[PDB]
Design a binder for this molecule. Structure first.
Ligand code: D12
Ligand code: D10
Ligand code: OCT
Ligand code: OCT
Ligand code: CL
Ligand code: NA
Ligand code: NA
Length: 552
């Protein structure tokens, strides 16, 4: 048959809006900004945003709309060579689906722990609390070994933090069941009712932002909000010399915008050919970076309040890693009237933000993979088995991040698997093929015939120069001034862990050069003609059903 289109223009936006607005906004951005000093994170953040994040995102959407194909076959239509971008995106999204559901596992654990008379992380008098812990209020009344009850609950119970990655400890069975419960939710929403949230689009979309306004209002009114915003906004120039801030902020754009995954291309392939997706992406792009920036005020206002209460530096008040959103926001809900009621709403909001995203990415790779075998899959019970196998295998690998030493594996996956040099590798090759091989001006003829008008030269230069320079320059300068990954600024990773971590990056990076080798080997003839035949697009806009022109 043919790839079914969206039922309406509104269906495309809500699916895309919930597909890349989520834990990448309210969870990953706050601690990446917190890790890389304060406001020095924002200059690379906005530079990468307006240089490549919007351009590459629109490029993927427009490629999907042009080819009417998924993550992988879109590149096959665009360019038979460099078709390994699809497989690299599939590997990246596979690892992302492996490690991104652990955040929802932790969120479910907090949601379950929240159904009590008193929130467990308000006061530290429980079994897991070390004798060093004491309350934030009486911290000033009472060196540098006095931990707060909030960090204790996250480390010494929820995580049961192990001394290192090479001490995995014992699997946390409570978190494994929470990990299975969210995976069962995704499976039961992917197999039946691929897009079944249409009845409650009003609540399932507006509430996550409605809660974000509530947290923002509470955060700004706190006594210590002044120092937090100055920490969040005012940049430190000396930190711009470290290449890590450019890598972190550079790939936080690519992470938050879900590009180089094949989900955007799949989402962009489900809309009409004669649909103006240029304007909607910019409005959708504004919603993402607006959410990350505005919610950044909320969490960083809490950090200033926490630092003021404890009388410690803002940079030393919480965890410089994943779990800042789990240390700041659960502290914010404590100061609210009826703390239990709001804490339930926050972690329900946190769940709805990521569940909608996980639905898109999991379906993105499933749709991308079934394109490889349209006959073997997408027919009867063979999709039932295949989707479960993807979810079951990806769940078992997620168990390694649930054990007591599971946090350290989480930082490895977070830094390497679906972020960092792997994203800079695919994003560079996405733009390099389009701008220099396919032709930036050559694609504009398709886009102008598609949205009805020719957009400005912003996209042309971003793919041609800005994105390759930003990707290549940051890739080179990261290795030149190499710094090993660390967890919470203290833990130094063992050599094999970094070697394992680089395998996660190289597992998808090596897809691009490999597929070139197979493509060259399969093609018969002289080497130059072999290459020349493999760069000719195979009629990407082969859809006479919708009015169109010739691709060349
Ligand atoms: C060209 C068709 C087959 C492509 C397979 C490439 C290998 C992908 C997986 C790499 C190691 C996980
Ligand atoms: C990490 C989970 C890996 C799942 C990928 C399944 C690929 C099946 C090829 C048809
Ligand atoms: C981590 C492995 C990803 C699976 C990709 C398979 C593509 C055929
Ligand atoms: C907290 C939600 C903010 C959304 C802003 C969108 C326009 C900048
Ligand atoms: Cl962002
Ligand atoms: Na979402
Ligand atoms: Na995002």
């Amino acid at each position: 048959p043919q790839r079914e289109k969206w039922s309406s223009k509104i269906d495309f936006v809500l699916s895309v809006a919930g597909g890349f607005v989520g834990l990448g906004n309210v969870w990953r951005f706050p601690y990446l900004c917190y890790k890389n000093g304060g406001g020095a994170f924002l200059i690379p953040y906005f530079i990468f945003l307006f240089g490549s994040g919007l351009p590459v995102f629109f490029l993927e959407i427009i490629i999907g709309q042009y080819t009417s194909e998924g993550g992988i076959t879109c590149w096959e239509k665009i360019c038979p060579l460099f078709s390994g971008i699809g497989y690299a995106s599939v590997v990246i999204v596979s690892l992302l689906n492996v490690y991104y559901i652990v955040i929802l596992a932790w969120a479910t654990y907090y949601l379950f722990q929240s159904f009590q008379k008193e929130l467990p992380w308000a006061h530290c008098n429980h079994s897991w609390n070390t004798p060093h812990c004491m309350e934030d209020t009486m911290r000033k009344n009472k060196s540098t070994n006095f931990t707060s009850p909030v960090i204790e609950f996250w480390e010494r119970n929820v995580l049961s933090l192990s001394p290192g990655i090479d001490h995995p400890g014992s699997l946390k069975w409570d978190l494994a069941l929470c990990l299975l419960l969210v995976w069962l939710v995704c499976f039961f929403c992917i197999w039946k009712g691929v897009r079944s949230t249409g009845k409650v689009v009003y609540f399932t979309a507006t509430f996550p932002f409605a809660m974000l306004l509530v947290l923002l209002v509470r955060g700004l009114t706190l006594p210590g909000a002044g120092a937090g915003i100055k920490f969040y906004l005012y940049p430190d120039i000396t930190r711009l010399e470290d290449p890590q801030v450019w890598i972190d902020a550079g790939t936080q754009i690519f992470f938050s915008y879900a590009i180089c995954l094949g989900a955007m291309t799949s989402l962009g392939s489900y809309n009409k050919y004669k649909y103006n997706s240029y304007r909607d992406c910019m409005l959708l792009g504004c919603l993402n970076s607006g959410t990350s920036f505005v919610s950044g005020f909320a969490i960083f206002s809490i950090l200033g309040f926490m630092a003021q209460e404890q009388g410690v530096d803002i940079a030393d008040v919480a965890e410089s890693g994943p779990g800042l959103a789990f240390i700041a926001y659960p502290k914010a809900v404590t100061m609210m009237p009826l703390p239990t009621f709001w804490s339930i709403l926050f972690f329900i909001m946190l769940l709805l933000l990521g569940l909608d995203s996980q639905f898109v990415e999991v379906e993105g790779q499933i749709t991308s993979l079934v394109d490889l075998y349209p006959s073997f899959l997408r027919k009867g019970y063979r999709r039932e088995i295949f989707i479960a196998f993807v979810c079951s295998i990806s769940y078992l690998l997620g168990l390694t991040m649930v054990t007591e030493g599971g946090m350290y594996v989480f930082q490895l996956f977070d830094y390497y698997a679906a972020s960092g040099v792997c994203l800079l590798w695919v994003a560079f090759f996405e733009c390099f093929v389009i701008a220099w091989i396919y032709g930036g001006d050559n694609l504009y003829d398709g886009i102008e015939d598609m949205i009805g008008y020719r957009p400005g030269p912003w996209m042309k230069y971003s793919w041609a120069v800005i994105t390759p320079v930003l990707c290549v320059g940051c890739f080179i300068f990261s290795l030149v001034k190499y710094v090993p990954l660390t967890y919470n600024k203290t833990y130094v990773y063992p050599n094999w862990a970094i070697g394992l971590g680089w395998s996660l990056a190289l597992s998808s990076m090596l897809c691009v050069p490999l597929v070139i080798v197979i493509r060259l080997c399969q093609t018969e003839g002289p080497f130059l003609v072999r290459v020349k035949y493999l760069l000719t697009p195979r009629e990407p806009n082969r859809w006479a059903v919708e009015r169109e022109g010739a691709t060349p």
